[PDB]
Amino acid sequence: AECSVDIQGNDQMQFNTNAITVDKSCKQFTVNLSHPGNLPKNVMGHNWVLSTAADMQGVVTCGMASGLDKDYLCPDDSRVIAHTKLIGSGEKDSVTFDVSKLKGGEQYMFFCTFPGHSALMKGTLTLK
Protein backbone atom coordinates (compact mmCIF):
# COMPACT_ATOMS: atom_id res chain seq x y z
CA ALA A 1 0.00 0.00 0.00
CA GLU A 2 1.10 3.55 -0.79
CA CYS A 3 -0.10 5.54 2.22
CA SER A 4 1.60 8.83 1.43
CA VAL A 5 1.92 11.41 -1.32
CA ASP A 6 4.38 14.22 -1.92
CA ILE A 7 2.87 17.41 -3.26
CA GLN A 8 4.46 20.69 -4.35
CA GLY A 9 2.82 24.14 -4.64
CA ASN A 10 4.89 26.55 -6.73
CA ASP A 11 5.19 30.27 -7.62
CA GLN A 12 2.92 29.77 -10.62
CA MET A 13 -0.11 28.74 -8.56
CA GLN A 14 0.15 25.03 -9.38
CA PHE A 15 -0.07 21.87 -7.32
CA ASN A 16 1.77 19.02 -9.07
CA THR A 17 -1.17 16.65 -9.00
CA ASN A 18 -4.96 17.02 -9.62
CA ALA A 19 -6.03 13.76 -8.08
CA ILE A 20 -4.99 11.83 -4.99
CA THR A 21 -5.77 8.17 -4.43
CA VAL A 22 -5.98 6.88 -0.85
CA ASP A 23 -5.63 3.10 -0.67
CA LYS A 24 -8.45 1.98 1.69
CA SER A 25 -6.11 -0.57 3.28
CA CYS A 26 -4.10 2.34 4.78
CA LYS A 27 -5.01 3.09 8.41
CA GLN A 28 -3.40 6.55 8.10
CA PHE A 29 -2.54 8.67 5.07
CA THR A 30 0.20 11.31 4.87
CA VAL A 31 0.62 14.33 2.63
CA ASN A 32 4.07 15.89 2.47
CA LEU A 33 3.71 19.44 1.13
CA SER A 34 6.62 21.59 -0.08
CA HIS A 35 7.01 24.94 -1.89
CA PRO A 36 9.69 25.00 -4.62
CA GLY A 37 9.30 28.69 -5.37
CA ASN A 38 11.05 31.94 -4.32
CA LEU A 39 8.01 33.81 -3.07
CA PRO A 40 7.26 34.21 0.62
CA LYS A 41 4.04 32.98 2.23
CA ASN A 42 2.33 36.40 2.48
CA VAL A 43 2.45 36.65 -1.34
CA MET A 44 2.25 33.03 -2.53
CA GLY A 45 1.52 30.95 0.58
CA HIS A 46 0.12 27.47 0.08
CA ASN A 47 -1.56 24.95 2.30
CA TRP A 48 -3.15 21.57 1.61
CA VAL A 49 -6.71 21.35 2.96
CA LEU A 50 -9.16 18.42 2.61
CA SER A 51 -12.97 18.53 2.84
CA THR A 52 -15.96 17.02 1.15
CA ALA A 53 -16.74 18.61 -2.23
CA ALA A 54 -19.90 20.03 -0.66
CA ASP A 55 -17.92 21.81 2.07
CA MET A 56 -15.11 23.17 -0.03
CA GLN A 57 -16.59 26.57 -0.85
CA GLY A 58 -17.50 27.25 2.82
CA VAL A 59 -14.03 26.30 4.05
CA VAL A 60 -12.34 28.45 1.42
CA THR A 61 -14.63 31.41 2.26
CA CYS A 62 -14.25 31.05 5.99
CA GLY A 63 -10.51 30.94 5.39
CA MET A 64 -10.17 33.98 3.12
CA ALA A 65 -11.21 36.21 6.05
CA SER A 66 -9.45 34.25 8.85
CA GLY A 67 -6.28 35.96 7.66
CA LEU A 68 -2.63 35.11 7.33
CA ASP A 69 -1.89 34.55 11.03
CA LYS A 70 -4.57 31.84 11.04
CA ASP A 71 -3.12 30.28 7.87
CA TYR A 72 -6.32 31.28 6.09
CA LEU A 73 -8.29 28.60 7.91
CA CYS A 74 -11.08 28.92 10.45
CA PRO A 75 -9.59 27.48 13.63
CA ASP A 76 -10.81 24.04 14.77
CA ASP A 77 -13.17 23.87 11.74
CA SER A 78 -14.70 20.37 11.79
CA ARG A 79 -15.45 20.38 8.05
CA VAL A 80 -11.69 20.24 7.51
CA ILE A 81 -10.78 16.57 7.58
CA ALA A 82 -7.11 17.41 7.54
CA HIS A 83 -4.78 20.26 6.71
CA THR A 84 -1.18 21.42 6.68
CA LYS A 85 -0.03 24.84 7.75
CA LEU A 86 0.48 27.64 5.23
CA ILE A 87 3.99 27.55 3.84
CA GLY A 88 6.17 29.81 1.72
CA SER A 89 9.22 29.33 -0.51
CA GLY A 90 11.64 26.73 0.83
CA GLU A 91 9.38 25.54 3.65
CA LYS A 92 7.60 22.23 4.08
CA ASP A 93 4.90 20.66 6.24
CA SER A 94 3.27 17.26 6.54
CA VAL A 95 -0.10 16.07 7.74
CA THR A 96 -1.23 12.56 8.64
CA PHE A 97 -4.90 11.65 9.11
CA ASP A 98 -7.02 8.64 9.89
CA VAL A 99 -8.42 6.98 6.77
CA SER A 100 -11.49 6.09 8.91
CA LYS A 101 -12.41 9.78 8.59
CA LEU A 102 -13.19 9.16 4.87
CA LYS A 103 -16.70 7.95 3.89
CA GLY A 104 -16.51 5.49 0.96
CA GLY A 105 -19.42 6.89 -1.06
CA GLU A 106 -18.40 10.53 -0.52
CA GLN A 107 -16.62 13.01 -2.92
CA TYR A 108 -13.59 14.78 -1.42
CA MET A 109 -11.55 17.79 -2.69
CA PHE A 110 -8.15 19.09 -1.70
CA PHE A 111 -7.24 22.75 -2.17
CA CYS A 112 -5.22 25.75 -1.03
CA THR A 113 -7.16 28.37 0.98
CA PHE A 114 -4.81 31.32 0.37
CA PRO A 115 -7.13 33.99 -1.04
CA GLY A 116 -7.97 33.25 -4.65
CA HIS A 117 -5.70 30.20 -5.02
CA SER A 118 -8.35 27.47 -5.04
CA ALA A 119 -9.48 28.38 -8.58
CA LEU A 120 -6.33 26.63 -9.76
CA MET A 121 -4.99 24.85 -6.68
CA LYS A 122 -7.60 22.12 -6.23
CA GLY A 123 -8.04 18.46 -7.04
CA THR A 124 -9.92 15.33 -6.08
CA LEU A 125 -9.17 12.82 -3.31
CA THR A 126 -10.65 9.35 -3.56
CA LEU A 127 -10.70 6.44 -1.18
CA LYS A 128 -10.50 3.19 -3.17
Ligand SMILES: [Cu+2]
Ligand atom coordinates in the same frame (compact mmCIF):
# COMPACT_ATOMS: atom_id res chain seq x y z
CU1 LIG B 1 -1.82 28.60 -2.39
